[PDB]
Design an enzyme around this catalytic site. Structure first.
Site, PDB file in Angstrom:
ATOM      1  N   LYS A 137       5.086 -10.123   7.711  1.00 40.50           N
ATOM      2  CA  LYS A 137       5.168  -8.681   7.977  1.00 40.50           C
ATOM      3  C   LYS A 137       4.066  -8.392   8.991  1.00 40.50           C
ATOM      4  O   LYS A 137       2.876  -8.407   8.658  1.00 40.50           O
ATOM      5  CB  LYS A 137       4.986  -7.857   6.697  1.00 40.50           C
ATOM      6  CG  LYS A 137       5.023  -6.342   6.933  1.00 40.50           C
ATOM      7  CD  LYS A 137       4.786  -5.531   5.637  1.00 40.50           C
ATOM      8  CE  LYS A 137       4.763  -4.045   5.979  1.00 40.50           C
ATOM      9  NZ  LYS A 137       4.392  -3.214   4.778  1.00 40.50           N
ATOM     10  N   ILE A 170       9.889  -4.081   7.327  1.00 44.52           N
ATOM     11  CA  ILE A 170       9.508  -3.587   6.007  1.00 44.52           C
ATOM     12  C   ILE A 170       8.924  -2.207   6.311  1.00 44.52           C
ATOM     13  O   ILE A 170       7.831  -2.074   6.887  1.00 44.52           O
ATOM     14  CB  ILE A 170       8.514  -4.516   5.304  1.00 44.52           C
ATOM     15  CG1 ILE A 170       9.219  -5.831   4.949  1.00 44.52           C
ATOM     16  CG2 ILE A 170       7.974  -3.833   4.048  1.00 44.52           C
ATOM     17  CD1 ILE A 170       8.306  -6.949   4.484  1.00 44.52           C
ATOM     18  N   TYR A 172     -11.938  -5.970   3.641  1.00 47.95           N
ATOM     19  CA  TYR A 172     -13.273  -5.616   3.179  1.00 47.95           C
ATOM     20  C   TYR A 172     -14.268  -6.789   3.142  1.00 47.95           C
ATOM     21  O   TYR A 172     -15.334  -6.707   3.777  1.00 47.95           O
ATOM     22  CB  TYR A 172     -13.251  -4.800   1.869  1.00 47.95           C
ATOM     23  CG  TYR A 172     -14.593  -4.213   1.498  1.00 47.95           C
ATOM     24  CD1 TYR A 172     -15.296  -3.416   2.404  1.00 47.95           C
ATOM     25  CD2 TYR A 172     -15.151  -4.447   0.246  1.00 47.95           C
ATOM     26  CE1 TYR A 172     -16.536  -2.888   2.075  1.00 47.95           C
ATOM     27  CE2 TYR A 172     -16.386  -3.911  -0.102  1.00 47.95           C
ATOM     28  CZ  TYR A 172     -17.075  -3.149   0.826  1.00 47.95           C
ATOM     29  OH  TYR A 172     -18.312  -2.625   0.475  1.00 47.95           O
ATOM     30  N   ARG A 225      -5.643  -2.047   8.901  1.00 47.96           N
ATOM     31  CA  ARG A 225      -6.151  -1.705   7.575  1.00 47.96           C
ATOM     32  C   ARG A 225      -7.181  -2.717   7.077  1.00 47.96           C
ATOM     33  O   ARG A 225      -8.144  -2.331   6.409  1.00 47.96           O
ATOM     34  CB  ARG A 225      -5.007  -1.607   6.564  1.00 47.96           C
ATOM     35  CG  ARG A 225      -4.107  -0.411   6.766  1.00 47.96           C
ATOM     36  CD  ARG A 225      -3.065  -0.327   5.653  1.00 47.96           C
ATOM     37  NE  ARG A 225      -2.154   0.784   5.919  1.00 47.96           N
ATOM     38  CZ  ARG A 225      -2.360   2.034   5.522  1.00 47.96           C
ATOM     39  NH1 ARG A 225      -3.436   2.339   4.800  1.00 47.96           N
ATOM     40  NH2 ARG A 225      -1.478   2.978   5.835  1.00 47.96           N
ATOM     41  N   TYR A 273       1.223 -11.013   5.138  1.00 47.80           N
ATOM     42  CA  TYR A 273       1.077  -9.639   5.622  1.00 47.80           C
ATOM     43  C   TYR A 273      -0.107  -9.560   6.580  1.00 47.80           C
ATOM     44  O   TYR A 273      -1.262  -9.690   6.158  1.00 47.80           O
ATOM     45  CB  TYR A 273       0.859  -8.719   4.411  1.00 47.80           C
ATOM     46  CG  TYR A 273       1.007  -7.232   4.633  1.00 47.80           C
ATOM     47  CD1 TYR A 273       0.909  -6.377   3.550  1.00 47.80           C
ATOM     48  CD2 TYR A 273       1.255  -6.683   5.901  1.00 47.80           C
ATOM     49  CE1 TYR A 273       1.062  -5.004   3.704  1.00 47.80           C
ATOM     50  CE2 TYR A 273       1.393  -5.306   6.070  1.00 47.80           C
ATOM     51  CZ  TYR A 273       1.298  -4.484   4.962  1.00 47.80           C
ATOM     52  OH  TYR A 273       1.452  -3.122   5.111  1.00 47.80           O
ATOM     53  N   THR A 332       0.825  -1.218   0.000  1.00 48.96           N
ATOM     54  CA  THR A 332       0.000   0.000   0.000  1.00 48.96           C
ATOM     55  C   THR A 332       0.846   1.249   0.000  1.00 48.96           C
ATOM     56  O   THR A 332       0.408   2.278  -0.499  1.00 48.96           O
ATOM     57  CB  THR A 332      -1.032   0.141   1.140  1.00 48.96           C
ATOM     58  OG1 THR A 332      -0.364   0.068   2.396  1.00 48.96           O
ATOM     59  CG2 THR A 332      -2.091  -0.919   1.039  1.00 48.96           C
ATOM     60  N   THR A 333       2.065   1.173   0.545  1.00 50.66           N
ATOM     61  CA  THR A 333       2.953   2.349   0.468  1.00 50.66           C
ATOM     62  C   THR A 333       3.278   2.704  -0.992  1.00 50.66           C
ATOM     63  O   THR A 333       3.483   3.880  -1.326  1.00 50.66           O
ATOM     64  CB  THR A 333       4.249   2.144   1.286  1.00 50.66           C
ATOM     65  OG1 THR A 333       3.889   1.832   2.638  1.00 50.66           O
ATOM     66  CG2 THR A 333       5.112   3.410   1.280  1.00 50.66           C
TER      67      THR A 333
END
Ligand SMILES: [Mg+2]
Lengths: 297, 289, 289, 289
Positions: C160, C202, C106, C137, C132, C43-44
């Site tokens: 992560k 990360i 979501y 989020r 991840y 997302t970064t």
């Protein structure tokens, strides 16, 4: 000022009363086996269900029995600062070295209200205060800017941080410009906390494994995080079992297995399930097996 | 009962003490202007900062001045059931109709511990109990299965639901097979709660607008939800302003503007900002004119 | 397999299009100044607003430009495992060393659903996977028992951990019995994570201060947590400023000040306020130097 | 202007494809049995695991089969507004009457970013938009002041409020003065929401019990809240069972028991446990005779 393994002491009971003989024995045993300090009459010591008289008596007895060998930080928690002042004044009179102060549970005040509570206690006594930040029990959270305002007072000297937010110490350190006794209020993240600038932990598990917990804390303070994590890993099953049901039910039962006191706690703390008791017993037996196998002189 | 607009009474202070004269006047004024019941020495009455003696004195004075004109539900909250028993026994002696009991804040017990706390209070008194479920202040949450277990006791007769989770009443109603006084603990959602099976609210805003709040509650109880929403719409600004800063700072200030008491609360409750005071003054000016 | 300071790369734009020139320059500059690995299109790197084809082309460029100098771990996130498989297969063909995989945002599946998602990706490729875990989020949280199930698969090789729950790594470590790359996904707690058994991070902030971040990570792997904390203290103002507004707005602006790219991000990431820009500029000046 | 029971349609599958025959039959059956509107390709319709081709085709087929009998509000959700624009533009060309738009999941933008997302969709189409506020899935929360800012746009015409915070509608109504379709996004609190000013619900349970759900909605709209609660009480067990495991697993299985479609959903949605299946079967048997 206050560093290392500081024990959030259980309060032993017998026939509905404070067990004074067990309490004195507990102080001696915990000091003998590596306590760096003692913290009587916090919630682990069942402060909510002690009478005001019992609270003061337990503080007095612990301070007396410690005999200056380690610091004694007395619980002076309340959601009413008038009451907190009474506990703190007595603590000073009884020879405590400092007090530990939570504020604002249930009544849920603003940051200004928290500040004024702590200032009232501060101005009423001559000994240092460790403020106790524990949103998971109190809902209210002493925010970093408020912590910095508190730190401007000469005798607010540290924090017991039970937020479990390991970013919090960093946010506080960015704003506080005097030396401050950052202390973990969470056994499971005590290593993470000291690596982040912490200098000890006010610990529940240290009631039961004071020698190992002291070694672990000293390792972090000496910068030996490999050794600290080794000990943390040994203690992890104990941590889980001591906190599975609402504390201090676990610690009290564990201490009873060590012959230190009766297992009983006051309502609303309730007896452990047979499964939890079994797990605690097996873990303690295993730690003792390991200690006996490895010891030599 | 217990039904309709039940006032979570403020406790007036004067020069550091309970203002007994203002308290008696407040009981008369609230009853005159439409209280369906009075709930002294709950959270809004600053139960945490009253001495044990003051708590009992406020309950006794309110019961005395109410003169049985409306139900009086006395606060008997504590995180120590031994203390809760003392408040509840005094309340009964003083002529309260019931007690309101929170448990488990800060010490954070299990469901079984909560059950045993309430059972201890239940067994020590002859008057009924409304259990107070308020996770936003106490962290602990009396779960539906625990509420059903509590409802099996003869004198656990209702709940003040301050969860703000409007599904909770449905989950409780699914499990409870006796009549039960479901009462809102949140003014902003009082209509939602009664539409979902509730039968009243233990209300902060009713301290200040007892007539309109009573009218709103009665409308819900008679099925006139259009009328109820009309009045809710008038009261919503008051609801917001009374909770902008930590309650009961807002309610105490509002009452002072009505000439009912001094504005002061005890630490850690603090004086309102001038902005909040101004907004409350404007709201009172609009309501009472 | 992966250790130290790994960079969650920003994706540079010009006129809203991927600036391949800037991206190649960023790979070279970050490697020159101490990156231990590169993690493009998380997302970064604005994975959510890149098209599937853009995503693939970004991964290919970074893998090629890295020229094997450091590991490239390609983002292959999606809430649809069928899409994640396509990203991971392309990543392998493009020469990525591993993939970084989030799941379940979501649509919010069960633990079994999460397991099946990761197993689908695992079984479709020959390169390793870093799981991840980012409930802040994604809402969903891969629980320790599920993580252990994942670690039982031969090519799931690390995590992560962006839970910000510093107790989590202890719980996973107890259940995992093979070499496993525990990597922080939170810059502010990177030191805490490594003290607790982690072996790297990360990082977003390493985009901007790769040399210092590399030094901080090195210190933790050396066991010198005192030096690590001193470096952390130097970087503290930077972390705060880079996350004040929703990332990657901050990192993209900071990189523009270093002459590496434009500040532009794609909606719903928006331009920084002048105050945030001013604060970042001051911090960059203090660091450089 | 959108009111009542609006069905968050499941998307039926067969042999890994959209089941077009079942979908057409479902539109007919739901309209016959009391749907007040249809909302295809939201998350209950598995929007995250549909291809873009499938998304558009399902919308087109539902709009076609509805034949204008009830409004069709097409899902046009994405965390990338460029993608959302494509879904919304297609929905319009396919004859949808409005679109339903979530934003900001996973990338977690600011309020300004959310506003710009919705403005971009708004400006790209001629049909109206219902804003989808669902922090429990998306983390981001469209705050009341942002909702009011959105309401200033001519074709932002309503909200699907899935916050489950029943105070929220009051806070929004305090700020929004124009005609606005306040719609519940939570079946369990649909009655509470309408009593608080709402005028309908975009409902999962209505897939399975459209006749009863429509009756319940109509009762609230006619002010008959006693009747609404009676029906809610009949449906509450269904509400619980349909959300026990991650939705739409429950709804898809229930629909299969009614002979409407196959039970299958796409990963990461997984098959129900035998216990959940049995409970749903018993509920269906109870409702349908
Ligand atoms: Mg060393």
């Amino acid at each position: 000022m206050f560093r290392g393994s500081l024990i959030a002491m259980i309060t032993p009971f017998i026939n509905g009363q404070v067990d004074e003989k067990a309490l004195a024995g507990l102080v001696d045993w915990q000091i003998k086996h590596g306590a760096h300090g003692l913290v009587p009459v916090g919630t682990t010591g069942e402060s909510p269900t002690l009478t005001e008289e019992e609270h003061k008596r337990v503080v007095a007895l612990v301070a007396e029995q410690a005999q200056g060998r380690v610091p004694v930080i007395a619980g002076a928690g309340s959601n009413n600062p008038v009451e907190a002042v009474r506990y703190a004044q007595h603590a000073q009179q009884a020879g405590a070295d400092a007090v530990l102060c939570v504020a604002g549970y249930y009544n849920r005040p603003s940051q200004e209200g928290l500040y004024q509570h702590f200032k009232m206690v501060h101005d009423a006594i001559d000994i240092p205060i460790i403020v106790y930040n524990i949103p998971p029990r109190a809902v209210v959270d002493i925010k970093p800017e408020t912590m910095a305002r508190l730190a401007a007072l000469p005798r607010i000297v540290g924090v017991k941080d039970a937020t479990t937010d390991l970013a919090r110490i960093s946010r506080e350190r960015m704003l506080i410009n005097k030396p401050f006794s950052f202390l973990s209020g969470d056994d499971m993240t005590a290593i993470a906390y000291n690596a982040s600038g912490g200098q000890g932990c006010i610990s529940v598990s240290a009631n039961i494994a004071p020698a190992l917990y002291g070694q672990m804390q000293t390792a972090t303070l000496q910068g030996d995080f490999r050794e600290a994590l080794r000990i943390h890993d040994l203690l992890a099953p104990l941590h889980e079992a001591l906190f599975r049901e609402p504390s201090p039910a676990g610690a009290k039962y564990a201490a009873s297995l060590l012959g230190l006191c009766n297992e009983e706690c006051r309502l609303p703390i309730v007896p452990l399930s047979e499964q939890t008791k079994s797990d605690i017993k097996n873990i303690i037996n295993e730690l003792y097996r390991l200690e006996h196998h490895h010891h030599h002189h």
